[PDB]
Amino acid sequence: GFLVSFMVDARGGSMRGSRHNGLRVVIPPRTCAAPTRITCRLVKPQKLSTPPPLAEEEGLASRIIALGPTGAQFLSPVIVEIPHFELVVLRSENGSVWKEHRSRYGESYLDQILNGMDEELGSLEELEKKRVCRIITTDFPLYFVIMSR
Ligand SMILES: [Br-]
Numbered sequence: 738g739f740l741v742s743f744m745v746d747a748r749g750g751s752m753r754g755s756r757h758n759g760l761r762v763v764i765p766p767r768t769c770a771a772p773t774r775i776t777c778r779l780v781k782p783q784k785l786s787t788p789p790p791l792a793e794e795e796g797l798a799s800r801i802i803a804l805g806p807t808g809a810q811f812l813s814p815v816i817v818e819i820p821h822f823e824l825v826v827l828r829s830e831n832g833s834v835w836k837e838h839r840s841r842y843g844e845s846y847l848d849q850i851l852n853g854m855d856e857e858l859g860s861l862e863e864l865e866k867k868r869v870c871r872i873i874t875t876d877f878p879l880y881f882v883i884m885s886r
């Protein structure tokens with residue numbers, strides 16, 4: 738099931754998914770007060786009871802991302818990079834409603850978010866080229882998914 742599964746604590750850590758094709762979770766130092774097992778698994782939209790409702794011009798650009806523990810709340814933002822097949826990040830807190838995810842910090846504060854971490858994050862153009870989307874979030878909802886429009 739799980740593409741990513743690792744223990745992390747206040748020192749921070751990260752793990753690349755086992756398919757080694759862009760999926761990656763970065764938990765910077767101090768974002769995580771107590772020891773936590775961080776996970777990620779991908780779900781097929783049909784496994785869902787309420788899939789993302791799309792308008793005519795909208796499609797899914799990724800599989801549905803389930804980050805664990807569901808509902809985790811970090812002390813500062815964490816980074817999740819997701820491969821995709823305009824791109825918007827949708828999230829569903831408990832699986833019933835879907836809304837746009839917007840990082841209220843965003844890409845201009847990436848260095849501050851990383852908090853000294855010895856991790857190399859590539860630019861947005863470098864992510865474009867690799868077809869990878871970077872989600873900056875301070876919590877884990879039941880689902881993320883990348884949507885095109
Ligand atoms: Br992976």
Ligand SMILES: [Br-]
Nearest residue numbers: 753757758759
């Ligand atoms: Br990777």
Ligand SMILES: [Br-]
Nearest residue numbers: 770771811812
């Ligand atoms: Br606190």
Ligand SMILES: [Br-]
Nearest residue numbers: 790833834835
């Ligand atoms: Br909805």
Ligand SMILES: [Br-]
Nearest residue numbers: 814873874875
């Ligand atoms: Br954020």
